[PDB]
Design a protein around this ligand. Structure first.
Ligand SMILES: O=N[O-]
Ligand SMILES: O=N[O-]
Ligand SMILES: O=N[O-]
Ligand SMILES: [Cu+2]
Ligand SMILES: [Cu+2]
Ligand SMILES: [Cu+2]
Ligand SMILES: [Cu+2]
Ligand SMILES: [Cu+2]
Ligand SMILES: [Cu+2]
Lengths: 336, 336, 336
């Protein structure tokens, strides 16, 4: 398309919402290609990632870890206004794995505190994709400080299974998984720092062990539990988008399955089916579609169980509805 | 199905056999859906896992690590009587990744020493699936103590390749891979404990490093080598089911291939073909089908070769038959 | 083929070139099956892997890490003359994951310094496959000392997408990824040695931590950058073959994608498409096909960003051509 044709396309400003929720959208595209506008302010902020009070100097797109999910359709243009407030101390940029050119956009979005930039790219490929900050020379440090999220580029005709049958979800959740590398003192207690820069050297030493101290969903151990647990109902169709910008993960819905899983996150690649545990490599997003069949509590985890239950990678689903004894039943309850 | 229809289904008790062998079964289903009954007694016992007398307080379904492979067909029901003898000291349960509801069955089978339970679930999805104990609050500890196994839910019409052609194996083996985390004292010697609970704190410390001290097949270094090597003959079709309940693995048959590999373990997902090394994420089982073409010794390993030859993840196959010079030949033997 | 039929086949002597380049070949087979001859001399030599002067005692096929890429077509025979100079100190052999029998050839090619051997095998399966040395009892040590490479067995009809449409590349590059485990002294300084065997004990201790000190392409940090950056032009189709003989990797072309990716490396397994980051398990090779659409510098990395930017797993592509503002444009450049 020419500059004139792009200038003529309708524009729609979208208000982002915080993970695990996703801003309102249509699965099947409304009309022809549009320039979808988003705005995100970067916030360097202290966040607590566990019940003990462990602190991390997060680098957060839109103030959250992960950054919010942006949703557009194939061949729409995503136009992002990215702002780096003067209150921040580091330069930041953004790299969309969904985009083509200039390192995903990082080469055109390096902004120092007090600057902003507007990047536009054509979403040519359908699927869920990671986005993350990547300043040359300090790439992993920003990413493992939480400066990453994902976007979803829906086919214009919505989702379909491998044989062309439509798959329409009732609800969608975005689970961003974060590996953190928090320095510890001689007592084995996590350290706290005044400014992000103070923690650099100590953090890089932990990073080099390739062993995170915490592996969490939505920025903290237990973030998606209790009143923040995800919800569904028997018969409800749920799409769970999951991303990990730096390290591998293996999602598993305890008590359920991934009925259709685009493990690579790309919609033109037919989904695997009937999955117990799927795999998303570091640097990618994946998506699983499931129709709940049993009520009760479910745990959604990274199935390296040490990472799930010792390091923090566990979320819960609260599901309403009638129990199905055909599917499962306790013939003899625990007894002598 | 109605309530009467379920109650009318035939019940059949099956005798289990220890891994890597598999109990008697038919690839194509015999008769209509059935309630297949299995019974497993849980044994907490000390086992030696290496050539240095290193001990692990194993938590073993049916007394073996891994627990035995249970085989049923799609839409059969699996009805398991699980027994936890009064001589054990810990509460246990079972979670079938093949099952739907109550955390895979874990929520309905929590049995203390001196108790038993019977769980029934409908095997609605075909494939090989992991099963493992998962007591709330102590999930990875039980799993990495060897309390895991797998089941196979065969399609009622048996296995097929991506084009619908039948794949009938002559024999099947179940290789359960286990990551162990054995504590060491300041001198580097593995520690021994009187009771399982005594090792809990020390073991979790090792678990959190995400670095196993041992990675083994059938519960010990060398368990499937030498006189315990698996066997085959040139021309024989072999299915190798592999599971890892907590950590990733990458099986490889040294000297052969995976002709058809259901890497995700689900039969409704077309198998990959001509595989050199396949990948099974922690929390899943996979299956590989291979027709042997050359006699001799083969090594079957986790292809992170440090895990295989330093940590213990290596098995052998002894194959009989005639050598095929067309496939391979020494044109010039090692010489000056 | 009978011995006579094979003897009547034409022979072609190939000249190998150093990675990341690939020797001359035709994508579509020229004529019928042939016996393709290759010769490689094993070189035990010191290589410097980082800018701190860190040394590794490399065990290099053809004098390079990785060893060179060998290209043949399905059902051709690969006849390798392997030489172990008397100037070397250890016994070596070769195992082709592409071959069938004798542990992939290792059982028929064990050569001490001063010996040579000639192995012939039929390339029955199409795809890219790892090859590596594997001396019984010292397997991982030789592999992580750089003694590994890959071969590509092209379909006789060249490459095709999932629907059978031809995929023809303009350029091809071979990236061999290597995990190194270099011993450190009590001051954190990397140790140096005057003989390969002198480093065995120390290296094994590091290998057992499953934590490499370096993860690099083509044997060294920054190897494939600057004077060795790979090149292309907008509109050019490029195949990137990637191998890792011992440990998992997750390739990603920063600023681009894997339009078609044979993640398992096997051409009869349909390729995934529109990939952001693909996954290659330790012990395998994979291949990605991409058509460049934007000029500029691209970074090709293992997307665990710590491995890429702290440990050494990053390469560059320098692409010429016109910028495409439809695909991406800076609406507002970084500004106050
Ligand atoms: O099914 N989760 O251990
Ligand atoms: O070729 N197996 O190390
Ligand atoms: O987009 N790769 O950092
Ligand atoms: Cu940043
Ligand atoms: Cu990236
Ligand atoms: Cu248990
Ligand atoms: Cu599980
Ligand atoms: Cu060697
Ligand atoms: Cu190998």
């Amino acid at each position: 398309a020419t500059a004139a044709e792009i200038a003529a396309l309708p524009r729609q400003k979208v208000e982002l919402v915080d993970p695990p929720f996703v801003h309102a959208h249509s699965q099947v595209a409304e009309g022809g290609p549009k320039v979808v506008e988003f705005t995100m302010v970067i916030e360097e902020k202290k966040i607590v990632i566990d019940d003990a009070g462990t602190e991390v100097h997060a680098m957060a797109f839109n103030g959250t870890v992960p950054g919010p999910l942006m949703v557009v359709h194939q061949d729409d243009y995503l136009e992002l206004t990215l702002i780096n407030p003067e209150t921040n101390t580091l330069m930041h940029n953004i790299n969309f794995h969904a985009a083509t050119g200039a390192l995903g956009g990082g080469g055109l979005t390096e902004i120092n505190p007090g600057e902003k930039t507007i990047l536009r790219f054509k979403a040519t490929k359908p699927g869920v994709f990671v986005y993350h900050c990547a300043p040359p020379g300090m790439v992993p440090w920003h990413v493992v400080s939480g400066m990453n999220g994902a976007i979803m580029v829906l086919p214009r005709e919505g989702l379909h299974d491998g044989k062309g049958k439509a798959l329409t979800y009732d609800k969608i959740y975005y689970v961003g998984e974060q590996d953190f590398y928090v320095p510890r003192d001689e007592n084995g207690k996590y350290k706290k720092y005044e400014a992000p820069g103070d923690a650099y050297e100590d953090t890089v030493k932990v990073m080099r062990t390739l062993t995170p101290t915490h592996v969490v969903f939505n920025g903290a151990v237990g973030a998606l539990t209790g009143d923040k647990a995800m919800t569904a109902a028997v018969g409800e169709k749920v799409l769970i988008v999951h991303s990990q910008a730096n390290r591998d993960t293996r999602p598993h819905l305890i008590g359920g399955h991934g009925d259709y899983v685009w493990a690579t996150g790309k919609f033109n690649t037919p989904p695997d089916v009937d999955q117990e545990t799927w795999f998303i490599p570091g640097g990618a997003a994946g998506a699983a579609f499931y129709t709940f069949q049993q009520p009760g509590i479910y745990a959604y985890v990274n199935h390296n169980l040490i990472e799930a239950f010792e390091l923090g990678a566990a979320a819960h689903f609260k599901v309403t509805g009638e129990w199905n004894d055909d599917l499962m039943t306790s013939v003899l309850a625990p007894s002598g």
